Amino acid sequence: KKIFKPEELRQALMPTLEALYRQDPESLPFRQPVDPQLLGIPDYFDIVKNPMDLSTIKRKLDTGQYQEPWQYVDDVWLMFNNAWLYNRKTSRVYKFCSKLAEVFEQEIDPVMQSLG
Ligand SMILES: CO[C@H]1CC[C@@H](n2c([C@@H]3CCCC(=O)N3c3ccccc3)nc3cc(-c4c(C)noc4C)ccc32)CC1
Protein backbone atom coordinates (compact mmCIF):
# COMPACT_ATOMS: atom_id res chain seq x y z
CA LYS A 1 0.00 0.00 0.00
CA LYS A 2 0.91 3.69 -0.01
CA ILE A 3 4.25 4.41 1.67
CA PHE A 4 4.39 7.55 3.81
CA LYS A 5 7.41 9.29 5.25
CA PRO A 6 7.70 11.16 8.55
CA GLU A 7 7.97 14.77 7.36
CA GLU A 8 4.97 14.29 5.09
CA LEU A 9 2.97 12.92 8.01
CA ARG A 10 4.08 15.62 10.44
CA GLN A 11 3.23 18.48 8.06
CA ALA A 12 -0.20 16.98 7.27
CA LEU A 13 -1.17 15.87 10.79
CA MET A 14 0.40 18.41 13.15
CA PRO A 15 -2.24 21.13 12.41
CA THR A 16 -4.91 18.71 13.66
CA LEU A 17 -2.98 18.27 16.90
CA GLU A 18 -2.44 22.01 17.07
CA ALA A 19 -6.22 22.53 16.86
CA LEU A 20 -6.63 20.36 19.96
CA TYR A 21 -3.96 22.30 21.87
CA ARG A 22 -5.67 25.59 20.96
CA GLN A 23 -8.83 24.58 22.89
CA ASP A 24 -8.50 26.44 26.20
CA PRO A 25 -9.47 25.23 28.82
CA GLU A 26 -10.75 22.02 27.18
CA SER A 27 -7.30 20.64 26.34
CA LEU A 28 -5.65 21.44 29.71
CA PRO A 29 -6.28 17.97 31.25
CA PHE A 30 -4.73 16.40 28.15
CA ARG A 31 -1.50 18.40 27.64
CA GLN A 32 0.51 16.18 29.99
CA PRO A 33 0.25 12.54 31.08
CA VAL A 34 -2.13 11.83 33.91
CA ASP A 35 -0.12 11.68 37.16
CA PRO A 36 -2.27 9.46 39.42
CA GLN A 37 -0.02 10.08 42.45
CA LEU A 38 -0.31 13.86 42.43
CA LEU A 39 -4.00 13.70 41.57
CA GLY A 40 -4.86 11.21 44.33
CA ILE A 41 -6.45 8.61 42.06
CA PRO A 42 -4.28 5.55 42.78
CA ASP A 43 -6.50 3.19 40.76
CA TYR A 44 -5.90 5.08 37.50
CA PHE A 45 -3.39 2.59 36.06
CA ASP A 46 -5.63 -0.28 37.23
CA ILE A 47 -8.27 0.99 34.79
CA VAL A 48 -6.17 2.70 32.10
CA LYS A 49 -3.63 0.17 30.81
CA ASN A 50 -2.27 2.28 27.91
CA PRO A 51 -2.08 5.94 28.91
CA MET A 52 -1.90 8.58 26.18
CA ASP A 53 -1.86 12.38 26.10
CA LEU A 54 -1.21 15.27 23.73
CA SER A 55 2.47 15.67 24.72
CA THR A 56 3.17 12.02 23.93
CA ILE A 57 1.41 12.21 20.57
CA LYS A 58 3.27 15.41 19.71
CA ARG A 59 6.63 13.80 20.51
CA LYS A 60 5.74 10.80 18.34
CA LEU A 61 4.83 13.04 15.39
CA ASP A 62 7.97 15.17 15.94
CA THR A 63 10.29 12.15 16.10
CA GLY A 64 8.93 10.08 13.20
CA GLN A 65 7.34 7.30 15.21
CA TYR A 66 4.23 7.01 13.00
CA GLN A 67 4.58 5.07 9.76
CA GLU A 68 0.93 5.67 8.72
CA PRO A 69 -1.71 8.32 9.43
CA TRP A 70 -4.09 5.81 11.04
CA GLN A 71 -1.56 5.14 13.82
CA TYR A 72 -1.73 8.82 14.75
CA VAL A 73 -5.53 8.75 14.68
CA ASP A 74 -5.43 5.60 16.84
CA ASP A 75 -3.42 7.38 19.55
CA VAL A 76 -5.77 10.38 19.57
CA TRP A 77 -8.89 8.24 20.00
CA LEU A 78 -7.01 6.19 22.59
CA MET A 79 -6.41 9.35 24.63
CA PHE A 80 -10.09 10.24 24.34
CA ASN A 81 -11.28 6.76 25.27
CA ASN A 82 -9.02 6.60 28.33
CA ALA A 83 -10.67 9.77 29.62
CA TRP A 84 -14.20 8.59 28.77
CA LEU A 85 -13.51 5.26 30.52
CA TYR A 86 -12.09 6.69 33.72
CA ASN A 87 -14.31 9.76 34.30
CA ARG A 88 -18.01 10.13 35.05
CA LYS A 89 -20.13 11.24 32.10
CA THR A 90 -21.17 14.31 34.11
CA SER A 91 -17.61 15.43 34.94
CA ARG A 92 -15.81 18.46 33.55
CA VAL A 93 -13.00 16.36 32.11
CA TYR A 94 -15.39 13.97 30.34
CA LYS A 95 -17.19 16.88 28.72
CA PHE A 96 -13.91 18.58 27.74
CA CYS A 97 -12.85 15.29 26.17
CA SER A 98 -16.00 15.23 24.07
CA LYS A 99 -15.27 18.81 23.00
CA LEU A 100 -11.80 17.80 21.79
CA ALA A 101 -13.31 14.81 19.97
CA GLU A 102 -15.73 17.10 18.11
CA VAL A 103 -12.84 19.36 17.10
CA PHE A 104 -10.70 16.43 16.06
CA GLU A 105 -13.42 14.87 13.93
CA GLN A 106 -13.81 18.15 12.01
CA GLU A 107 -10.04 18.62 11.57
CA ILE A 108 -9.00 15.07 10.73
CA ASP A 109 -11.63 14.29 8.04
CA PRO A 110 -10.35 16.62 5.25
CA VAL A 111 -6.75 15.71 6.12
CA MET A 112 -7.24 11.95 5.90
CA GLN A 113 -9.18 12.38 2.65
CA SER A 114 -6.22 14.34 1.25
CA LEU A 115 -3.70 11.68 2.40
CA GLY A 116 -5.64 8.97 0.52
C1 LIG B 1 -2.08 21.97 33.89
O2 LIG B 1 -2.09 20.81 34.68
C3 LIG B 1 -3.36 20.58 35.27
C4 LIG B 1 -3.21 19.53 36.39
C5 LIG B 1 -4.28 18.45 36.41
C6 LIG B 1 -5.64 19.06 36.12
N7 LIG B 1 -6.75 18.09 36.22
C8 LIG B 1 -7.88 18.29 36.94
C9 LIG B 1 -8.19 19.53 37.81
C10 LIG B 1 -8.60 19.06 39.13
C11 LIG B 1 -9.22 20.13 39.90
C12 LIG B 1 -10.52 20.45 39.39
C13 LIG B 1 -10.46 20.91 37.90
O14 LIG B 1 -11.29 21.56 37.38
N15 LIG B 1 -9.25 20.45 37.10
C16 LIG B 1 -9.24 20.90 35.73
C17 LIG B 1 -10.25 20.31 34.76
C18 LIG B 1 -10.28 20.79 33.31
C19 LIG B 1 -9.32 21.87 32.85
C20 LIG B 1 -8.33 22.49 33.83
C21 LIG B 1 -8.29 22.01 35.29
N22 LIG B 1 -8.68 17.19 36.78
C23 LIG B 1 -8.06 16.36 35.94
C24 LIG B 1 -8.48 14.97 35.36
C25 LIG B 1 -7.55 14.24 34.44
C26 LIG B 1 -7.96 12.89 33.86
C27 LIG B 1 -7.97 12.61 32.52
C28 LIG B 1 -7.58 13.55 31.35
N29 LIG B 1 -8.40 11.35 32.37
O30 LIG B 1 -8.65 10.84 33.64
C31 LIG B 1 -8.40 11.79 34.54
C32 LIG B 1 -8.56 11.62 36.05
C33 LIG B 1 -6.25 14.85 34.06
C34 LIG B 1 -5.86 16.18 34.61
C35 LIG B 1 -6.85 16.93 35.58
C36 LIG B 1 -5.69 19.58 34.67
C37 LIG B 1 -4.39 20.24 34.19
Name the residue of 53, 93, 95 whose CB sits within 8 Å of the most ligand 1 atoms, as the mutation to test its pocket: 93
Measured from the Cα of 86, ligand 1's closest atom is 30
Q: Residue 35 belongs to what domain range?
A: 2-115
Please report the resolution in angstroms. 1.9
Closest to 56 measured CA to CA, from 20, 93, 30, 28: 30
| CATH code for position 19 | 1.20.920.10
Q: State the total domains in the chain.
A: 1
Q: How far is CA 4 from CA 12, 24, 47, 102, 103, in A?
A: 11, 32, 34, 26, 25
* DSSP 8-class letter at 82: H
SS3 of 40, please? coil
Who contacts 33 (Cβ-Cβ below 8 Å, separation ≥6)? 51, 53, 55, 56
Angle, helices 92-114/6-21, rounded to nearest 10 degrees: 150
What's the rounded Cα separation, in Å, for the pair 26 and 30? 8
PDB experimental method: X-ray
d(CA 65, CA 59): 8
- Residue 28 CA to ligand 1 centre (angstroms): 7
9: which residues sit within 8 A by CB, 6+ positions away? 61, 66, 68, 69, 72
